[PDB]
Amino acid sequence: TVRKNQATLTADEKRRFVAAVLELKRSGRYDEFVRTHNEFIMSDTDSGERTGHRSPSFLPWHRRFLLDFEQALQSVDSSVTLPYWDWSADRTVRASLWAPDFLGGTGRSTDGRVMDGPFAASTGNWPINVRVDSRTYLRRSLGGSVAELPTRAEVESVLAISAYDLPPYNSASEGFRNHLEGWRGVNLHNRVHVWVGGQMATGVSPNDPVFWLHHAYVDKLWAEWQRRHPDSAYVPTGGTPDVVDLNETMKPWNTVRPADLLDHTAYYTFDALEHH
Amino acid sequence: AAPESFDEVYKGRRIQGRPAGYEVFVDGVQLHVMRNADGSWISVVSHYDPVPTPRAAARAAVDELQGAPLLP
Ligand SMILES: [Cu+2]
Ligand SMILES: [Cu+2]
Ligand SMILES: [Cu+2]
Ligand SMILES: [Cu+2]
Numbered sequence A: 001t002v003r004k005n006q007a008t009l010t011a012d013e014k015r016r017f018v019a020a021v022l023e024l025k026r027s028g029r030y031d032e033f034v035r036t037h038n039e040f041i042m043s044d045t046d047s048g049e050r051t052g053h054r055s056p057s058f059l060p061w062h063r064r065f066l067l068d069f070e071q072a073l074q075s076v077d078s079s080v081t082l083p084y085w086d087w088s089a090d091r092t093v094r095a096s097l098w099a100p101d102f103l104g105g106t107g108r109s110t111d112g113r114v115m116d117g118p119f120a121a122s123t124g125n126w127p128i129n130v131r132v133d134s135r136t137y138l139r140r141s142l143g144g145s146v147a148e149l150p151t152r153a154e155v156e157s158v159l160a161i162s163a164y165d166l167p168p169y170n171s172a173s174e175g176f177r178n179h180l181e182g183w184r185g186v187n188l189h190n191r192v193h194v195w196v197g198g199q200m201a202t203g204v205s206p207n208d209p210v211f212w213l214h215h216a217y218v219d220k221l222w223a224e225w226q227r228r229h230p231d232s233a234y235v236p237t238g239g240t241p242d243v244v245d246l247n248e249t250m251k252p253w254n255t256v257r258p259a260d261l262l263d264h265t266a267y268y269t270f271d272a273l274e275h276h
Numbered sequence B: 001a002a003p004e005s006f007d008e009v010y011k012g013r014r015i016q017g018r019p020a021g022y023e024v025f026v027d028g029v030q031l032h033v034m035r036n037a038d039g040s041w042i043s044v045v046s047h048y049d050p051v052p053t054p055r056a057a058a059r060a061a062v063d064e065l066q067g068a069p070l071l072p
Helices: A011-027 A029-043 A058-076 A152-159 A176-181 A189-196 A210-228 B054-065
Strands: B006-010 B013-019 B022-026 B029-031 B033-035 B041-043
Touching (some): A011 A029, A011 A058, A058 A176, A058 A210, A152 A176, A152 A210, A176 A189, A176 A210, B013 B054, B022 B033, B022 B054, B029 B054, B041 B054
Antiparallel strands (some): B006 B013, B013 B022
16 A cells, blocks of 8 residues: 555565566456556547546546556555656666566567567567557667656656646646646656657557556656645636536546545555655 | 648658548558647657647657558
């Protein structure tokens, strides 16, 4: 019930996380998370209904999506929690993240295929089934399409933004949510997807297990923003067309509101989270 | 006011775009694309990476695909 920095996992925790992810894949459950995410990112538009992306509910929606996935992991092995990837710190291909005992490395030159780790196509254990093209193998090009992951100083600049979100509550917004998402400013969350490349750069980005670790750290940064800004909170707070207001429920669950997801501590804690 | 249509061969592949609110095709297979508020574009195979135009999104898809057929 503690989410830990990936860099701190023990060999046994890495093993159990890998095995639980692979069992959700085998049983068919994993692919439906990939599908859900793609459906939402293909439908979340700036000029219409938007829930999982490009909108204030980007953060609570991914928080609940990650909770669904973590609960599915825990049904296979109750000891497993989602770890997080602090990409401001572990910013090279040399990070133990990308070691063959954890997620495997970058893809080869020719076709971007990941050739090592538990998710390499050659293992037979990670078919890419939910996809936008014919290729059925995990791909990555770490640092190929953008040179650099965000730095801590860039992160700090975003954490300093006091307003949670602003009209028009889309990819054009000023404020924290859209700078954290990355459509404006120095670009945190979007740029990491682009830096990993392969399926992580696409609508079917949960095909790469690093998806979860990236979003767990995005989620941690929301929690950090909250501590920096106890006087700020989720907006909008009612009556906003096409956007999920604080007390409105969110699709696909329909039974939970951003209000139910602001306080992570109802569901989990971090290994380390600074006091305000 | 939609962008103009286009049709060219880019890296051996035919990319087409036309207003619909805008459709893109790679070798006759529709590619999901979306316009951002600021006028930039993305496709489903580059969905976190804004590019200025639909043709730019089509070319980015051809770059991404490395010869692979798109799936509907
Ligand atoms: Cu889209
Ligand atoms: Cu997403
Ligand atoms: Cu994302
Ligand atoms: Cu204070």
